[PDB]
Nucleic acid binder design. Structure first.
Lengths: 107, 91, 124, 71, 119, 133
RNA sequence: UGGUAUGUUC
RNA sequence: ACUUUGCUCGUUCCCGUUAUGGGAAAAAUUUUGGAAGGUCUUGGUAGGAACGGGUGGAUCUUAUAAUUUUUGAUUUAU
RNA sequence: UUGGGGCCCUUUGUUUCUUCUGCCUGGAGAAGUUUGACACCAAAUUCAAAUUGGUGUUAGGGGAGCUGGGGCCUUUCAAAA
RNA sequence: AUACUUACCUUAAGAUAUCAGAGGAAAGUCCUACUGAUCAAACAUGCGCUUCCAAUAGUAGAAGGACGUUAAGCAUUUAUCAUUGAACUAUAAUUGUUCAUUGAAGUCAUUGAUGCAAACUCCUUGGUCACACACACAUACGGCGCGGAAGGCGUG
């Protein structure tokens, strides 16, 4: 429990590694995504290229890569005064985990 | 792996490497590492906007390297051979 | 040129590649070797780049665009895998697949003979 | 993993370019396996203003480290 | 759970990989490496213009498309149709999947199910 | 409507679409079709392939008649004007000069143009069935 | 129970 | 579905009769599998099998998403 | 066996499998073919030879047997109708 | 070559196709020259499969180069910063202009760089194969000579 969290991972046994992954997904920061996976509530995800997606999480992963359904991407584009809101609907999408900045669970 | 070992073959021969900032360096390769850190000696250094200077030695961190150009004979080095047989290693 | 559908980067030894890097530069050369980090070794690779002055002819609108491309020649370079972005195949190898097979069987014969000799020489 | 080969640069004046623009010159006192380096009496070459009595540089930000002395 | 083992299951399906340049690669997908090195075959690299007049696009990725060797010389937009592209894994931002495939068959990790039955 | 007949063409292009486009480049360089590859060619069954009169080419792979091909034009006059373009200087495709002359029999598409200027098709198909005998 | 390296003797 | 019963039709043979019934089975036909032989072609012709280990190299998983390559500071931005 | 015609010889170290003999009024002769032979490189003993350490080469075509595979035909056997 | 002397080392683990079914040492493990289905590799072997394979009836041509010449081509555009003195225009602390002095750096180039375009010369590469010098074709074109190169698909 706590002792496997504190110990360095090169010492831990294989079953302890699998146990720590389940523990950090259940009682952790990524537990947020897990709740929205199970309660089937949409999340708002803010990407590194200044695009915002609204979607439901079908699966997620250690690197925060996630399979999403009913994805809606929102972005805005500006030159000088001019600004345009563009929006796009995608049915099913894989999202590599390194782009995400913040993930918000919708009430 | 083979490319890092090819860089170890080129020790003592004039290599030319371009860093990720844009600078070019051409000099003897004194020492190289498994991490690709290289130390060039008697090096002619071209800055990104083009100025050339002379440096006595330089140590570049190998993370910053784009490419390295080694001498042209090293295509005949034996680490490129596909079909090769070993002498049954000892205890 | 057609490339086999199940041809990974280990099959494409001695083909002529077209490696693309992050700064918009293309490296063209015979592929010699690769690694876990995907850092190649290219035999006669020639760097090309599009100058900033030629670049606005690429922007979407004559019939065919003509881009003078600044190329430098370098030889037997090793690239670094961090910079590589995607690779495309330009030309097939010099030797045919049958003729490549013949060479490989020959080289296996000669190598086995040489280590047999080195063994029997260290015995005496 | 493997410590960098800077045993010959110890206690000698050295100029290294932090990031891509800054250029810091100091006496090299120690190094790490990440190529962190700590050098005394640093100065930032542009007029050039001194940094402090003892500085450490994260080797993530070092590109090249040429030596302005004998070696 | 690693979703790369999910992504390896696809193996013969028309995807669209949207990379970090902005360039999008549409094509039939062959293998995926354990570092997400996609190898696609019948690909159609393209670079979407931003629909607002004054905004340019990525300029480096324009150079990258022309230098692939596949840009049609008469073509108006930046498209390059080329057999066999190979893509290093850190470049991929997102992968637009097909509409048809069932997620609830594919997302079952056989190894997780294996250990969970065993223990 | 009069089809020209060409001997001494190269017989190694193979694919008809590739053969027509390469020939048509050697006819009129910087043509519309020849300088844009991966355009569809018009199929004009009973859209000029090329301006200045060229309507179709027609080759076959039949081992009797390899190098020969037949270009059919819009009208009777352009057929004679095309010879005028040579002006007694032989056209050359690849490294071989192409002798050319008006055909002993007009083209089928040329007959379709003149007849519009299907019973004919009945006659031709019965001819084909008689030649199958 | 080893390897590579070094230099001396014959 | 099994068992008994007469009636109607039926690939082939026989009989009662050529209305039709009874009996027999593919023994005539085809497709599928195998053996042998013929013909034509295409490839090989000095190694091969079995056993073995403190044997080399590939691929895969985990350390490994924490500064030196792949879990983002190169869409030039406010 | 001899003669004639055509084409080829840049085969450039004049057939390039190796050695030795040899050639343009010619295309030839002898010996050899993988635990072997041949070519070449480097040294130092104070020329050469000697040895030790290396890199290569040992081929192309046709035939007989022996054998792997396909297509088509015949016979025989079994299950389907 | 031997031998002797030192000096430097003497290690990340684990694995070898998957799923299902029968058997052996209620849960799972292991195994089966066991059995199905999928996958992958090699080797044979085929498809009326798809693309490509250069004049000699001629002095050519195709593909790719030149880090080749014309060439100082033709058209644009570039060549420091601070301090002090002097004249100078001026709405002006003297902003503008010219000459000299001290200090600081300073890739070479200006016959350069950049934009455009054309001619010429030359290198590498290829079945420079066989039969032909032929009146075809709407279902548009016997893809009904032998090889070779590269892929696609199928079987064993």
């Amino acid at each position: 429990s706590s002792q496997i969290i504190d110990r360095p991972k090169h010492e831990l046994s294989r079953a302890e590694l699998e146990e720590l992954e389940e523990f950090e997904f259940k009682h952790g920061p990524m537990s947020l995504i897990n709740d929205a996976m199970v309660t089937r509530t949409p999340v708002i995800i803010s990407l590194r290229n200044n695009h915002k997606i609204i979607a439901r999480v079908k699966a997620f992963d250690r690197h925060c890569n996630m399979v999403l359904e009913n994805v809606k991407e929102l972005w805005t584009e500006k030159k000088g005064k001019n600004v345009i809101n563009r929006e796009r609907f995608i049915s099913k999408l894989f999202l590599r985990g390194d782009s995400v900045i913040v993930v918000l669970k919708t009430p | 792996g083979i490319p890092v070992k090819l860089l170890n073959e080129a020790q003592g021969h004039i290599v030319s490497l371009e860093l990720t900032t844009g600078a070019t360096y051409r000099g003897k390769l004194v020492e190289s590492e498994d991490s690709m850190n290289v130390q060039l000696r008697d090096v002619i250094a071209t800055e990104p906007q083009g100025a050339v200077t002379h440096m006595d030695q330089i140590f570049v961190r190998g993370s910053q390297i784009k490419f390295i150009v080694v001498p042209d004979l090293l295509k005949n080095a034996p680490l490129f051979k596909k079909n090769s047989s070993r002498p049954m290693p000892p205890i | 040129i057609q490339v086999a559908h199940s041809s990974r980067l280990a099959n494409l030894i001695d083909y002529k590649l077209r490696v693309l890097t992050q700064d918009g530069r293309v490296y063209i050369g015979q592929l010699m070797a690769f690694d876990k980090h995907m850092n190649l070794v290219l035999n006669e690779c020639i760097e090309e780049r599009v100058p900033k002055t030629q670049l606005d002819k690429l922007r979407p609108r004559g019939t065919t665009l003509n881009i003078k491309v600044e190329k430098r020649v370098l030889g037997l370079t090793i690239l670094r895998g961090e910079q590589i972005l995607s690779t495309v195949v330009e030309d097939k190898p010099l030797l045919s697949k049958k003729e490549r097979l013949v060479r490989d069987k020959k080289e296996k014969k000669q190598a086995q003979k040489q280590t047999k000799l080195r063994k029997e020489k260290e015995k005496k | 993993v493997s410590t960098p080969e800077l045993k010959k640069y110890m206690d000698k004046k050295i100029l290294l370019n932090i990031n891509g623009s800054r250029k810091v010159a100091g006496i090299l006192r120690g190094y790490d396996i990440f190529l962190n380096v700590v050098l005394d009496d640093a100065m930032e070459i542009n007029n050039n203003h001194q940094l402090g009595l003892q500085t450490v540089i994260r080797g993530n930000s070092i590109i090249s480290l040429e030596a302005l002395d004998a070696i | 759970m690693k979703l790369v083992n999910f992504l390896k299951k696809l193996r013969n399906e028309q995807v669209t990989i949207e990379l970090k340049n902005g360039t999008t690669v549409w094509g039939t997908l062959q293998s995926v490496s354990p570092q997400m090195n996609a190898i696609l075959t019948d690909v159609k690299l393209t670079l979407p213009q931003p629909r607002l007049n004054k905004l340019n696009s990525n300029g480096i990725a324009m150079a990258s498309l022309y230098l692939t060797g596949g840009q049609q010389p008469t073509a108006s937009d930046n498209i390059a149709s080329l057999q066999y592209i190979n893509i290093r894994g850190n470049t991929i931002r997102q992968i637009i999947l097909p509409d048809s495939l069932n997620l609830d068959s594919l997302l079952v990790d056989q190894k997780q199910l294996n250990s969970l039955r065993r223990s | 409507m009069s089809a020209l007949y060409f001997q001494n063409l190269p017989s190694r292009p193979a694919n008809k679409e590739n053969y027509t486009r390469l020939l048509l480049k050697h006819i009129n360089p910087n043509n519309k079709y020849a300088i844009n590859p991966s355009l569809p060619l018009p199929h004009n069954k009973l859209l000029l392939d090329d301006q200045m009169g060229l309507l179709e080419v027609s080759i076959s792979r039949s081992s009797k008649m390899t190098n020969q091909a037949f270009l059919t034009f819009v009208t009777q006059e352009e057929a004679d004007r095309f010879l005028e373009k040579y002006t007694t200087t032989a056209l050359k495709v690849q490294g071989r000069k192409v002798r050319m002359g008006k055909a002993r029999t007009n083209s089928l598409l040329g007959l379709s143009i003149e007849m519009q200027k299907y019973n004919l098709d009945i006659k031709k198909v019965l001819k084909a069935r008689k030649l199958k005998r």
